């Protein structure tokens with residue numbers, strides 16, 4: 609080469625992510641009581657989630 | 658736990674149906690017939706209170 613210049617290039621790298629929170633009761637058995645009494649059998653999925 | 662506000666009132670609306678026969682309009686007629694000319698009227702497919 610006998611003549612040169614400077615070029616620029618951009619790049620993006622993801623670091624974070626939106627934090628999503630889900631409520632088990634308000635999603636499955638929001639307000640009703642019979643739904644809660646029936647869901648009390650599955651007493652491990654919500655805590656694991 | 659996520660609390661939910663309880664509903665205060667209840668609003669019920671139902672589409673109408675077969676029209677009223679207006680028994681009171683016929684009972685309040687001004688042409689009162691005689692016991693010899695007793696008037697008979699038939700009513701069906703109505704909704705009376």
Ligand SMILES: *[C@@H]1O[C@H](CO)[C@@H](O)[C@H](O)[C@H]1NC(C)=O
Nearest residue numbers: 609610611612613614615616
């Ligand atoms: C290199 O290129 C630039 C832009 O075209 C010019 O201004 C400059 O004179 C050149 N250099 C030489 C040594 O030709």
